[PDB]
Each structure stands twice: as structure tokens, then as C-alpha cells.
Amino acid sequence: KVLRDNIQGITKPAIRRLARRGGVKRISGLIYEETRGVLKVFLENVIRDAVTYTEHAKRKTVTAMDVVYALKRQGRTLYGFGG
Amino acid sequence: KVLRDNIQGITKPAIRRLARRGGVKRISGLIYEETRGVLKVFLENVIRDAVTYTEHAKRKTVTAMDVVYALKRQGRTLYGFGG
Amino acid sequence: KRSRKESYSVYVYKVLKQVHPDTGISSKAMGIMNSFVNDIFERIAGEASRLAHYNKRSTITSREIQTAVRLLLPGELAKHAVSEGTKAVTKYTSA
Amino acid sequence: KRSRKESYSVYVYKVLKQVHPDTGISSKAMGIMNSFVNDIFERIAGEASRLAHYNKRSTITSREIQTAVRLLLPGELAKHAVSEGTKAVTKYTSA
Amino acid sequence: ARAKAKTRSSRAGLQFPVGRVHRLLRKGNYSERVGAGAPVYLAAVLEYLTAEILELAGNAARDNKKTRIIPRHLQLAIRNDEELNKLLGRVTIAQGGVLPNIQAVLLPK
Amino acid sequence: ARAKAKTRSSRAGLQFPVGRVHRLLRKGNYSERVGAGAPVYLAAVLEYLTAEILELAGNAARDNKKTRIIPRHLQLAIRNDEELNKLLGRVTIAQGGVLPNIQAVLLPK
Amino acid sequence: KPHRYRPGTVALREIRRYQKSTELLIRKLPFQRLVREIAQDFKTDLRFQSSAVMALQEASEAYLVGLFEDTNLAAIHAKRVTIMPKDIQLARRIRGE
Amino acid sequence: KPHRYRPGTVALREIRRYQKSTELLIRKLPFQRLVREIAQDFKTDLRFQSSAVMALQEASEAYLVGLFEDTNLAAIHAKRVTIMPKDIQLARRIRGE
Amino acid sequence: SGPPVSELITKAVAASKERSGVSLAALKKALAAAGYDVEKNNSRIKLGLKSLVSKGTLVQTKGTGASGSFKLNKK
DNA sequence: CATGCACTTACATGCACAGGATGTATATATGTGACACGTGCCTGGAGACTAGGGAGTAATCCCCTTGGCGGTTAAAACGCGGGGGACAGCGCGTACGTGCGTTTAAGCGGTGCTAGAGCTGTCTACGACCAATTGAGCGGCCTCGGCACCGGGATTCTCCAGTGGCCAGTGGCGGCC
DNA sequence: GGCCGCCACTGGCCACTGGAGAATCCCGGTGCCGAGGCCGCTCAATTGGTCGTAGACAGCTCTAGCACCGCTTAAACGCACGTACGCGCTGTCCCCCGCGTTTTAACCGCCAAGGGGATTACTCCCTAGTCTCCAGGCACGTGTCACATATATACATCCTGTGCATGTAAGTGCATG
């Protein structure tokens, strides 16, 4: 029912892959947990708004269109999911 | 009437004043002209916007309302001018 | 002969005397407050407009406004505004 | 069947064949172009509404559309958009 | 023959103008109809925000022993509150100045 | 006695729907009245913009010898134009990837 | 003798590869797990469109990657090639976060 | 010998003064001259509300001052106390200017 | 050809006789003034100075290894 | 007698403290205009009443979402190692900081003008509203060929071993004192 | 005869290079599933007329900006001398990616189930709109005290001279070679 630790599901090699996409040549060992915290902050910031949209839509199922609304609210508009 | 290099009308000690208000301790000699170019880019953008407002307004004179509309167009909202 | 112009002067000055009866104000600070209250008015109004579009509603209700407050206003100001606005809506409902 | 859902597939496909008769299109890229055109459309609509409000204009006309596209679009994109729109406005003016 | 005039702000028990905000929302073109409680709720929210920021400006003015609110007081009140700073991270204020703030490495020794 | 129902996009020689965009403006609540040439001008502007972005996308797909345009090609086109990237810096394409970019200090001797 | 590449060469080849690639680098279902875990902290027992999860994955990877280019710029700006969490804090403070 | 402060002391005092002060750090008349100079390039015979020029002012020191705290953060990141124009360039590019 | 860089380093340190020992930068400037391809032979200078240190003919004042100041022995 | 050593003693260096000097605070005196408060008004907002229509609610169904079960491997994780990088120390030369003298030009008061913002009447172009209608555009189907995956060869990049040049350590000899 | 300077012998160190190995790019081939084209439907764009009004212009007004001028210092510039700071170099130590191995859970993929998204209908609560009437907030006028400014002390604090704690080196008496 409940979930306790899935932030560690964003594993270190995945962060390494993202950093190589980011052009980072060398990654410190202290990076990964801080990036987990930063990712947690960004995800909660968007998904609180998403929950707000979905509840205001009187739905209990989260739709991607609300995710688009939340992302374009925070100046992070995404192309490829509108409609 | 025709003005030529009023970009240097922003004096170097005024740039030092602006840096000290920003808490800058030590300023290179290379700084001032580069910052003049940067503020030139900033001013020309915002005055392009404010002008476009003004000829759309069918007015010859720039109003401060046009200015604050231009700033809020850039996400740089300014308060205290009748907006 | 001058055309009348709108301001928030009486309301902000009276709520200032409510919160601090002994405190004055400078006029350009009132201009800043005018810009602030206007700015938040179009922020909430635009959020309410697009939220009314997203659920295809042509009527913006207090639910939309409250949703917009939860969106733009973060944390404690949102829930305090919800409580006070709910009180105001309840009092208007009794009115 | 179900209710009709609006899309811009046919127009973008026509424009694609105008610029490239030879090449194809992917449907997820089609969703990207729909997001793109809807985003630009709502942007221009927003500044049109704002500018019409600033001049207190009850009717939204082409001149402030021109103003808004000159405002948003950078440089030669804006000038050629003005040129294309002016050409189309003249042709529709001539019916 | 007719009921006496009574304001809707008083009907909410509020100071912010219900009729003015209602008219501005109607003419601001956000929806073609509007719920009755929506502008009352809106005016209540703005009155609450104005009251709290006026409290903070009053504390700022009292700390500097000045009776009247100054844009410097507004700048100090907004920038020293992390909630209001995150509300207004992109807002600039005329003649506001900044927080008195130095880096520790800029200090001597 | 009706004439043949002709289309306004053809009247302006355009591809984008004049009637649909005019309907969107009438129901998108930006003003209660809309000048007749305004959606025509808007559709022309949109057609121009779509023409350039699609042309750049087809050019990029041809550069990658690909006969059907890809969101990767959309990213590569939209990021390699200065004015388009300045128009759309804050906007992300799904599955777009990133520009090939390595700093010179990252490169070896 | 078993070959061993000199350090960073494979890292640069990784950079070229994943700049060339377009796919998501995050494991899909652990991301779904974490998204639902954050979701129940706001409202429990909700349902998700998989499209919403994929959109969150795309936006999250994009924000992270752009943060890493900013971090790389800060690190080389500090004349270093190894990124640090202080670089990330600097980048977030510049971005206004 | 005459009195002479060591370097940085006057800088600290004026930093405290100008952080405490709110008054304009630009001479007003050459600022107005530069505004008219730039604006004439885009449209001829442009006239200005003085209030419009003033709003253009506090916008100018607002953008510039924020750019210098960004620059100062870059410099203290770079273990320096003297700013260099590439720090400003870094701040602009990370902000996306 | 000429003599190896060790003797040139000895005249480089003996040219000044400051209270503090000569820096690496100052001896590089001294070899530049006297004439040497110092851009090609930084490692040669480092090994020569370290070898002279190991004999005890030179004593390093404040730095360690090739950094800091370098001064002559007691005799 | 002489000579080296050790002990004593003068010399020198760096850290700590008093004292001056100047900047900043802080206390008292004085005007003033800016904020605040009484006043006329009209205009925008409330009062009464209605139409109707957007919206709340009931029903349903099916499609989408959740839940679960097996295979498999890529994916993560763990360990070794060893190079590359961070970073501290040190110095150095320079480039701003600070300080003092000058010019000027920014700034303030006062004059004068008029473009130009802006208000008001007209009225006309234009667009919303409404009824019919259709055809264009959208939902669904179907085929295909472009392309993703697979498999094979060439290419390129890289890294490290072999090699020659370059330099310093070493030995030996002649010449002079 | 011995010792030192110079010339010659020799080994160690650094860069240059070729080649091997491995990752990658490139080349068909082929099955397959989105793309796109066809086809059937429907709803919304069109067409046409009307009515009412939105804004463009004429005209007029007064006002704010623009320029000029004339003093009048503030600061901007400029020079000069000095420190402290970027920064270049290097030593050193440790951190983190390369690589190989083990585990593991993610993912396909397959299937069940059911839940709520969504759609349709129905009826009604509200609210947009109209007319009437009236008081609230803003323009207007004024007055008056909070604050700006000036000035005189008073302390803070920062630099610096210098007074004490600590390292150093030399002189010389004394013991003894």
C-alpha cells in the first residue's frame, strides 16, 4: 500500500547517463544524493500543482494534460503531449 | 539633437556604485565596457518593446505604462508606476 | 474638468489603519501597492480563465479562484487565504 | 464511434507537402507541431487581448496582431511574418 | 418602496470592494459568466495579502523608528520573508534597494 | 439561391483554417469582438512559422538521410536557429535529445 | 594483457553517444514508483495515465540535463573538470530557485 | 604620514552605504540622453515622460544589480574577489541571455 | 650545447641573494634573461633543482619540492 | 700559547596592545511639503426581477487503469585499481584601491513654446447574431514500405610498446701552479 | 706532484612513432507496424441579412515636455604610489571512472478484473442583464507635523607605532689541546 524508499530508484548509473547527456566529463561522489534532492524538489513542485489540477478536474486519475498545464505554469512547457 | 556615444555617459564610477550596491568588492578594468554593452542590449530590447507599444498606441511620446508593460513582458515586473 | 481615475487608496489606507492605527504611509509606496494588488489580480484572473477553459466551464466560481490560490500562492498563505475566504463566502452565504 | 476531437493534421500535412513533397512525418512529431501551433496561438491571443485592453479596444483587429508578432518574434522572423500576413490580408481584402 | 443600500463587501463583512472587483473581472474577459462567490473570495484573498504585507511593513518601519511606510520598508519586508520572496522573486520595486548583505569571504580576516 | 460556399483560407491562399481559428478566438475569450482580417493575419503568421520550422526539419532529416521527420530532427532544427531558440528557449521537445556540444576544455589535447 | 582505456575516454564516448541518443535514461517503473510515492504525500490512492508518467520523465530528464550543462559551465568557470554539489547550488541560485 | 586606508575598507564602507541607501547610482541627464539616443534609432522624434525615463532607470539598476550578485556568486565560487567580464558572461548565459 | 642547467641554476640563484630564497618564477625569468628554452625544459629545471636540493648544496626555504623559495646552503 | 666550545649576551622577528583619527552614529534645532483629512459629486454599484442556460446530478460502460505471474537479461551494484584532478602552498607582478587635485558637467530655478495627450461629438464600417447547408475535415480501416533490428566488413581511434634523440652523470686526462 | 677544468664516455629520460585491438561507421536484408491514403459521416464554416455599436477622425484644449540659460558645486577624471590578488607552478594525496563479475529486478508480455472517465439526459440555480436610485470614492482644497537637513558631540574602528614573547648569532672566558 504505502511506499517508503523509491528516491533511491534513481540510481547512480542513471545519473551518470544524464550527466554524460549533460556533457559532464567527471562526476563527484557527493553529486548523486544532492541531485536526488533537487529532483525530488522539482517533482514535488510540479506534482502538487498536478494534484491541484486533477482534483479541480474532480478526477482521481492523473492525466498528462494536467501535467502539461503544471509544467507550462512553471515556465517549463513541454512539446509532445499537448492534447 | 543627434547623440553619438552616450553609452559612455554611464561613467565608470557609476558602474562602481552599482557594483557596490551589489556588494562587489573588486572590479576589473575590463568590466565597464562589457557591462556597457550588456546594459545596451538590455535597454535596446526593452525600448524596442516600449516603442512598439508606443506606435501601436498612435502616440509620439513614450509613457511609463508602455514601459511597465514592456518589463512585465520580459518577466522583470517593476512596481510603483501606475501599473 | 478631469476624468476620474481608479485607485486602491481608500481600501489600502483603511486596512493599514486596521492593522496598524499608528502607522502612516508614503504615496509612492502606495503606488507600489497599487501595482502589486493589480498584478496579483490579473495573475489570479488569468489562472481562473485558463482553468475555466480546461474544464470547459464558462463560469468561474470560488472553486476556481481557490484552485488558483493553491497554484500561485505557495504554502501557508494559500491555506490561510482559503480559510479566510471560506469564512467570507460563508458570511456572504448567510447574507 | 465517439465525439470529434480537433486536430491540425491535414493543414500541417499540406504545408509539409508545400515545403517538402518528398518526405514523411511521424505522428508523435505531429503531436509536437500541434503543441507548437497551439502554444504560439495562445501566446499571440494573450498579447492581443492585453494590447486591446491597453487601448481599451472592444474589438481585436489585425493591427495589434501585427504589433504582437513584432513584439514576440525576434527580428527577421517577425519582419517576414509581417510580410506574409500583409500579403494574405491584402489577398483576402481582394476576396 | 425600496430596500436601503447595503454593500456586498459588508455582506461579506470585508473592506475590499466586491462590486469593483466583480466589474473588473466581468470586463477583464476571463469567463462569460462568473460565480457569485468568486469575486468575494478574490477580494478577501487580496485584502488578506495586503493586510499581512502591511503588518510586515509596519514592523520594518517600527524597527527603523519611522512612522510611515517607505518603499525601502517594503523591500526589506518582502526580501526578508522566504515565502514572499518566492512569491516575488521576479518582481522589482522602484527605489527599493536590496537587502544589506555581504559575503563572509568579503569580510576581512 | 446560395452561392458556392468558398473557403477563406483559399481566399487568402492559405492552408490553416480561417474559420476554426476565428471560432477559437471567439470562444477563447480574448475580446467579445474580433476584426475579420485578424484571424487571417494570424493564420498567415502561423503558416509562415510552420513553413520555416518544417523546412528546417526536412533539411535536418535529409542531412540524416531520413525520409520521415523525427522529433530528434525537430530538436536539432529548433536549437540550431538563433532566433527560433530565442523564441523557444524555455520549451522542451519530448524525445528531442540534446545538441551535440562538448566544451573545448573537455576535449583532450 | 586485458585492455583498459585511459580515464575519461569512455566518458567522452558516453557523452557523444547519449548526446546522439534521444531515449529516456531513467528506469521507467522505478520512476513510476517514486512518482506515486510523491503523489500519495499529496493525495493517496490516485491513478495515473502512463502518458503522464512519461511526460514527467521527459520533463525531469530535461531539467536535470540543463542543470548539468549549467553545472559544467560553473565547474569549467572555476577552472575544474569535476562537478561538485556546490556547483549545483550555485546554478540553482543563479536560476532563482 | 597622512591617513590612508588599506584596500577594501572604503569598499566595505561604501557597500554598507549603498546597500543602506536607495538613491539612484546613475547621473540622470546622461541616462536620459542615452535613452533618447537609443530610441531615436528605432523611431524618430520620440518624446519621453520623465517618469518613464525613471522607470527605465530602476529597471536598469535592478537588472544590473542582480547581474552583479550573480557575478559575485560566480567569483566567490571561483575563489576570487576580483570580478572579470567572463563571470558576467557566465551569469548571462546560465540565465539564458 | 654548453654546460648543463645545474650551473645555470647556480648563477640564477646567486645573481640576487635576497633575504628570501628565489622563486621558481624568478629563476625562470633569470634563465629567460640569460637565455634558455625554459618552455621546453620545465621538467629539466624541476629535476635539476631537486637534484641540487638532494646534494644539500641548496636548501629550500618555504615551499616544498619545486614550489616556493630556494636559497643557498651555509657554505 | 692557542683554540674551540659553550655560555652568555646583544641583535632581530613576530605577535599583541595602546592610541589617534576619522568615519559613523546620535542628539538637538528648524522648516516644509506631503500626507492626511474635510467636501462636492456623480457614477458605479446595489435592489428587484427574469430567462434561460450553463451547470449539478443520475446512469452506464467500457476502456483504461490496476493488479498479478513467469523469463530474461540488461542493469545496477560491488570491488580493484590506478591514473587524473582537486587543491594547498608559495610567490610575483601587476592592476585596482586609495588618496589628492581639477574640470566639468550634472543639477537646480526660472522662461517660454508648443506638440501632443487626451476629451468629446458623429457616424459609419464592421462585426456579432441567426438560419441552412454542405463539404471539409475527422473517425475508422488497410496496405506497405520505410525503417528498426540483425548481421557482416572497413574504418578510425586510441593506447601502448619499440625506437632514436637529448641531456646530465661520470670518468679520465693534460696543464698549470 | 697534485688538483682542477675541460673533453669525452655513458646511462637515463623524453618525445616520436607504428601497430594492434577495440569501438564505431557503414553496407545489405528483411519482417513489421505506423503512415498515409481511402472512405463514410457530421457539424460547423459558409452565406446572407440585420442591427447595433466601436472606433476613427474633427476639433479643441491645456499641459507636460522640450529647450535655453545661468550659476554652482560634486563628482569624474586623472595621476601616483602602493598592496593584495589572480594566477601560474608544482607537490601531493585521494577520488572516481574503467572494467570485470554477481545479482536482481525491470521489462516484456500476457491475462483478469474492475473503476471511474466520459458520455447522455434531465431539471434547476444562478446570473447576466435592465432599470432605478443613491451613497462612496475620488477630485479638490488645505493644514500641519514627520521628517529632511544642519550641526555638535560621542564612540567605533581601523591603522599604526611600539612594547613584549621568541629565535638567532656572535663574543669571549675558560678549559684544555
Numbering used by the authors:
A (entry chain F), B (entry chain B): 20 to 102
C (entry chain H), D (entry chain D): 30 to 124
E (entry chain G), F (entry chain C): 10 to 118
G (entry chain E), H (entry chain A): 37 to 133
I (entry chain U): 35 to 109
Task: List passages from the publication reporting this PDB structure.
Here, we report cryo-EM structures of human H1-containing tetranucleosome arrays with four physiologically relevant NRLs. The structures show a zig-zag arrangement of nucleosomes, with nucleosomes 1 and 3 forming a stack. H1 binding to stacked nucleosomes depends on the NRL, whereas H1 always binds to the non-stacked nucleosomes 2 and 4. H1 contacts DNA with L1, the amino-terminal part of α2 together with L3, and α3 to stabilize the nucleosome and contribute to chromatin compaction.
H1 is absent from the stacked nucleosomes of the 4×177 array, but is present on nucleosome 1 in the 4×187 and 4×197 arrays, and is present on both stacked nucleosomes in the 4×207 array. H1 that is bound to nucleosome 1 always contacts entering linker DNA via its helix α3, whereas H1 on nucleosome 3 uses α3 to contact exiting linker DNA. In all ten focused-refined maps, H1 shows three DNA contacts, similar to what has been described. The H1 loop L3 and the N-terminal part of helix α2 contact nucleosomal DNA near the dyad, helix α3 binds one linker DNA and loop L1 contacts the other linker DNA. In summary, as the NRL increases, nucleosome 2 moves farther away from the stacked nucleosomes and the trajectories of linker DNA at nucleosomes 1 and 3 progressively approach canonical values (Δβ = ~0). As a consequence, H1 can contact linker DNA, explaining H1 binding to stacked nucleosomes in arrays with longer NRLs. We show that, with increasing NRL, the linker DNA emerging from the stacked nucleosomes is more relaxed and permits stable H1 binding.
